[PDB]
Design a protein around this ligand. Structure first.
Ligand SMILES: *[C@@H]1O[C@H](CO)[C@@H](O)[C@H](O)[C@H]1NC(C)=O
Ligand SMILES: *[C@@H]1O[C@H](CO)[C@@H](O)[C@H](O)[C@H]1NC(C)=O
Ligand SMILES: *[C@@H]1O[C@H](CO)[C@@H](O)[C@H](O)[C@H]1NC(C)=O
Lengths: 75, 504, 504, 75, 75, 504
């Protein structure tokens, strides 16, 4: 398959546990760092661009994250 | 007797004003009931079966190509043909090949060929469509009569009896009447509709491991397809997401069958509900159903018996369970009839005023001439009590200790509502068994929110919503004003919460 | 019934007491009407055939040049004459084939060549013309009152019509009449004479597939004319629009007929209403007509019946249509003949309060023996509730629920109020009985602008009006001087809206 | 030869499909694409042909566009 | 639809006068006549938008015809 | 001779090369060339014939339907399947209709439905491909001198007679050559690869008329096609651009096969070229071809011919051809052998002083005894002059007047050197001349401003040009500096020219 959409996005809030919450939240973490632990360089570079913005000492702040958050998961 | 230790039992305080047992049965934890006028019964929405369903679509998660047929034509003509492009039975794709003198083509470059594959299928994910109406629940309920660890365990032999009854509201017979005599009857004004909105809940079936899956997500994943269809020769639809057309270099066009997807549909399938099937009906769990019972028809048998005098004994030493409600199991002398079993757990011994509550309600030996081990509850007041159950000459007293101050209960029963809220959204202002101003105003105020906040945030798994909330709380106190920036750290406070509030 | 589930269906509930409710009714589904003691009724403009009409202009789409003769005079040797050149049948040119000695002339120059072709037609399209009269309207009245579950569509009995009686509103008889089974007969005073415009409209008749075409357009197609009907071979004006022959500097007169013109016409008729003239009288489906209902004769029936008691087993399950209504087909277990059987919108507690409206005015069991079908169209309140049927104690309720919003209906009498409106201009604000002069507007203020719009942009099309509209919706977001602003972005957006409504 | 009538100009408004309406709204377009793609040249042509004597910010477009709306048809 | 597009685009310029040529010289001009003649009202509406844009002496002259000729062809 | 009068017959008395001189002999008329001493000849691109053509598509303009079928599905059962969906020879469109109590299940709502018609083509229209090979061009060669009674057109034994010469040149053999025994031979080597734009030109056929079309146009036609060749039901593509699916106001969705698109295409082709068909060979007219006719190996049949004795009796009043070239048709009744016709031009005749320059230079008569005839050109001077025969007290002297203006006719080769300019477009410098500077470059500044000027205006059919050419020529008059107020005037009025050098 190509694109697989997540039934995650639209779960079903009930008292009984979801299909597999466990192993859910640990994956996004795994990837978004198991990515920077491979193509870490993108860090320092990605960081620069986060500097070339509204450089608010509380804004560059966000941007830095907006970039490293996206790279990892292709979007 | 049931609902004791369901890690999530909820004692619905009656009301000396008409029977409004407006309680939302959970398909998981449970809710027990108590009012002066009646014994104390409780319910556990046990089975939630779905009758019939529609086979909207079928997908294949393990295709299998068979015949690789290739055709070619040089720049001399337009395209290729190939015997198979006129069958649904296959899947073709045409492009170019550096057609030159390699094949002896007058003209050079430009060619165009087309390879195909006969598209079979190994395992298909058979989804379904279950109209909200035609389903059905089965709420079993028990009573704190004289039971003896007869709790849970056997249920069918128990239902042909007066204390354990099994009713079942259909979206068609929405007001079942559970008549457990010796006590009375029970009203049920259930809404076999506002359940889990099985509207957009196609019921999956991926190799006998079915999960109730949201509608959307069902149409959304593409691979093969066949449905509302008489199987016959499954004329598929799509198929690209399985046969892979990659032409090696630029002379030959090869096609491989992309891999099953079998479990990549299991990671896809990251929704919440897990279903079980009989084949007949859609037996499942995890759901909710809002009702209303009639307390009127339920007689306290006990207050007519002469309290029992003789010996009592703790066959089962008192066990505190889930927030300070203690079960004691005791047996009797051995030559008595249907009589009350006195029990006032008190502050002290002499001025034994009865202090605390008596979940059990009316405790009464079954008309037995044998040591009846009657299993019964009680709610000790925070601190040190004395579960004393006897005549008074021989008080089989007991030293008890409930470690829960009243303030430390309010803070922790604040969440027994915090979650029953964020799991029941607004059907949370439904436990409010009454027509109150705020029980009503609520179902309404936190309504244009359940509707709003959800519409504009109904697409983001756990992680994803913290990532927004935390971003909002920063948008919080940190900003130009504290005006339209309070509601930022406000609604942003919900998301951060909702994510962690479902977990614990 | 007739309209228990047709998307178009609109509800006119005017208890105006005017004994009338102007109501626009076309082949776009229908309308139901109800008021005091008046059995809610369904009017459905079904058929609107055109009886006798005769052709106005016939066109040829399939030319066929018979023989081609021709003559060429030599340079100033005179001129080329062909005896045909006079007989209307053929058609020729007077070119200049330069010629000299080689070409057989005693001189060098432009002798003249006249190539004649005998023209003939193979297949044409005649434009039968229709006038207000020769028009017959077929309305279908059906009262919910009390009827059948499946027979709500059966349409064969108009003699047994206790409800469904077929009218037949002619132009010469604007007024009408209805026959019922104990119900008042109804009278619709209409205007077949001016319903849907017909002066500007004809019936193309090619290939046997016809369609109502405008007048303007039908007088401008560029093919061969044939005025009147045929006397066999006829004389065609414009026998060349098809015929085409262009010889360049040589003696070679290339007379090519040009083919067919089906597509050439089908294709240029993408606004023409498909119509099936069958046999003698052309039938037009998809019309429009404005009537008025004279509500005097129609007075409820079976009101003097006893609120019947027997339980009611829903034969099927309670549905909803695009209007929140609900079919609730129940059963009557054999307790006497005809009697009423009441229902209520039990908004939760037992049978206590009656809520929401009931569309069927009065439900009545007209059957004397055992069980029989009947279906009540209700209007469940915007939220939840049940459905009581029969009476109090031995009443069966079916749980039901209606979603959407209280103000989601205000986003419908408004969106449906752009269709009713944008497909009947001002003859649209005609669904609800004259409430005074307050209407000397909604059906006035529009012939003030709309009749000025008719001219202004009257000639547009989808694509077109957007680029002529959006530029307006832009100009009004950029008016430097004036009040242009308000009328601009308005006249702009409304145009683009008119297109973005009905059929788009 | 040319059948210049365009009844789709003189539409009738009813609860029905005006004959061949399905692909009405789309057609007029795909022929502006079948035009430009095969005539990419004119792309930049009407860019200044319009720009010049557009005499405005936006006007440039309402030209550049109301030009690239002639060529496709009346041509 | 079934637009059987524009061959008028590429005319195999030569000696022997192209197909149906004799016609095409006027045809695209006639369609745009039989049109205004019908719905002239596109007057105060057409000439209107003209003064609305640019305002130059020679603006409307070219703006009014920018649209007047796009009106048809898309009718 | 061969072209004693064809619109557009030009001369090249200026071979101006070491026997090397080019030309573009098109299907449109011909050219006569005569070097300082060489006999004069008339070449012409008589015909051209593609040979093998691989058909690319087979568009279909007439669809015929059948097997109308269909299926529906209640709003619950998902999709709708019909076996013909697995037919590929059936077209369908699945769409949600309406239903419920009255039609199927009862559960209301807009369920799904599909309908499948069959397909087939009544008349197709292949489009064969033309590749720069397989295009043998024909070229006729007619010298002057010995040639009578326009025995010119008369194309017989175009072989035997050395006064005529058949020269076919394939792109794989451009260096052909004429065998004119007596006048020597004629060395020619053309450009069969760069004549018309054969690359890009398909070859179609509706019924039987044949065309020439540009690729684009051929691949941008909605019409259901079949590519390459195949005998079985050409698996059609777009089986639906010629079929229609009527949407019933409610319940149905019925097909309506659009009508024959013949005249629809038969009109779209307007801008194309006509083309015949002889056998399998794709004969066509209108082409143009380049060449380098070497003037060597050509000799005046008779430089050693005693002047013909005494009969200048011309059996034709010496008419005159356009472009100013008197033609005479002398007949030497009294004469002998193959002597030199003693012709000549005389401005006064008082005392033989020529001022003509006849171009049929070295006129001769053969087998000339009596009954001998013969024709011959003449460039009469401006004003008055007498044609003549050298000696004879029977020396004919038909007075002749030359009309027009000396330098007047000049204005002609500016607006004719323009026709060759507009058409040919850039291969318009390859007229008769060896080039170096202002001739090698003329191209160099044309090829560049020929491509540029193509890209930004190709696609501009005629009516387009002028429009986006006049409303352009305005931009030049407006603004200032010239750099952008001239380039827009030049390319504005000049655009217009390729509009008047077309139909005129
Ligand atoms: C098991 O079920 C029987 C009746 O079915 C009951 O008498 C007995 O007490 C139950 N024992 C348990 C497990 O409590
Ligand atoms: C129409 O009326 C007949 C009366 O005999 C009834 O039996 C039948 O069921 C009806 N038809 C339909 C549509 O079911
Ligand atoms: C062509 O000329 C030849 C040579 O004199 C003659 O025999 C023949 O009949 C002519 N054919 C025509 C065109 O009549």
């Amino acid at each position: 398959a190509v694109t697989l959409p997540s039934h995650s996005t639209r779960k079903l809030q009930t008292r009984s546990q979801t299909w597999l919450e466990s192993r859910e939240y640990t994956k996004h973490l795994i990837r978004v760092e198991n990515w920077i632990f491979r193509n870490p360089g993108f860090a320092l570079a990605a960081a620069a661009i986060a500097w070339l913005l509204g450089s608010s000492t509380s804004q560059k702040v966000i941007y830095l994250v907006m970039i490293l958050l996206i790279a990892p998961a292709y979007s | 007797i049931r609902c004791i230790g369901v890690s999530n039992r909820d004692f619905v305080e009656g009301m000396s004003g008409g029977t409004w047992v407006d309680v939302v049965l959970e398909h998981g934890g449970c809710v027990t009931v108590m009012a002066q006028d009646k014994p104390t019964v409780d319910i556990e929405l046990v089975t939630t079966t779905v009758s019939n369903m529609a086979e909207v679509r079928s997908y294949c998660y393990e295709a299998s190509i068979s015949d690789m047929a290739s055709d070619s034509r040089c720049p001399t003509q337009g395209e290729a043909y190939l015997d198979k492009q006129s069958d649904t039975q296959y899947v073709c794709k045409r492009t170019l090949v550096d057609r030159g003198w390699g094949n002896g083509c007058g003209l050079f470059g430009k060619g165009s060929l087309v390879t195909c594959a006969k598209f079979a299928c190994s395992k298909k994910m058979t989804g379904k469509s279950i109209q909200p109406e035609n389903l059905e629940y089965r709420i079993m309920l028990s009573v704190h009569g004289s039971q003896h660890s007869g709790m849970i365990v056997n249920d069918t032999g128990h239902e042909t009896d007066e204390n354990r009854a099994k009713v079942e509201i259909t979206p068609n017979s929405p007001r079942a009447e559970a008549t457990l005599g010796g006590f009375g009857s029970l009203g049920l004004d259930c809404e076999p509709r506002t359940g889990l909105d099985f509207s957009d809940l196609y019921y999956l079936t991926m190799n006998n491991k079915h999960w109730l899956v949201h509608k959307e997500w069902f149409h959304d994943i593409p691979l093969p397809w066949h449905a509302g269809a008489d199987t016959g020769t499954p004329h598929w639809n799509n198929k690209e997401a399985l046969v892979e057309f990659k032409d090696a270099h630029a002379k030959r066009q090869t096609v491989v069958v992309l891999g099953s997807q079998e479990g990549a549909v299991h990671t896809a399938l990251a929704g919440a509900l897990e279903a079980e099937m009989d084949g007949a009906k859609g037996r499942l769990s995890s759901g909710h159903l809002k009702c209303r019972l009639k307390m009127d028809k339920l007689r306290l048998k006990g207050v007519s018996y002469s309290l029992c005098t003789a010996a009592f004994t703790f066959t089962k030493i008192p066990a505190e369970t889930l927030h300070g409600t203690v079960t004691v199991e005791v047996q009797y002398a051995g030559t008595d009839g249907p009589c009350k079993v006195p029990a006032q757990m008190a502050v002290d011994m002499q001025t034994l005023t009865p202090v605390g509550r008596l979940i059990t309600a009316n405790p009464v030996i079954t008309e037995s001439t044998e040591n009846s081990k009657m299993m019964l509850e009680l709610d000790p007041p925070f601190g040190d009590s004395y579960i004393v159950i006897g005549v008074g000459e021989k008080k089989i007293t007991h030293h008890w200790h409930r470690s829960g101050s009243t303030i430390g209960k309010a803070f922790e029963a604040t969440v027994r509502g915090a979650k029953r809220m964020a799991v029941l959204g607004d059907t949370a202002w439904d436990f409010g068994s009454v027509g109150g101003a705020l029980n009503s105003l609520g179902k309404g105020i936190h309504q244009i929110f359940g509707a709003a906040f959800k519409s504009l945030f109904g697409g983001m798994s756990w992680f994803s919503q913290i990532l927004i909330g935390t971003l909002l709380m920063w948008l919080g106190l940190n900003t130009k004003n504290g005006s339209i920036s309070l509601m930022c750290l406000a609604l942003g406070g919900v998301l951060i919460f909702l994510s962690t509030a479902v977990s614990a």
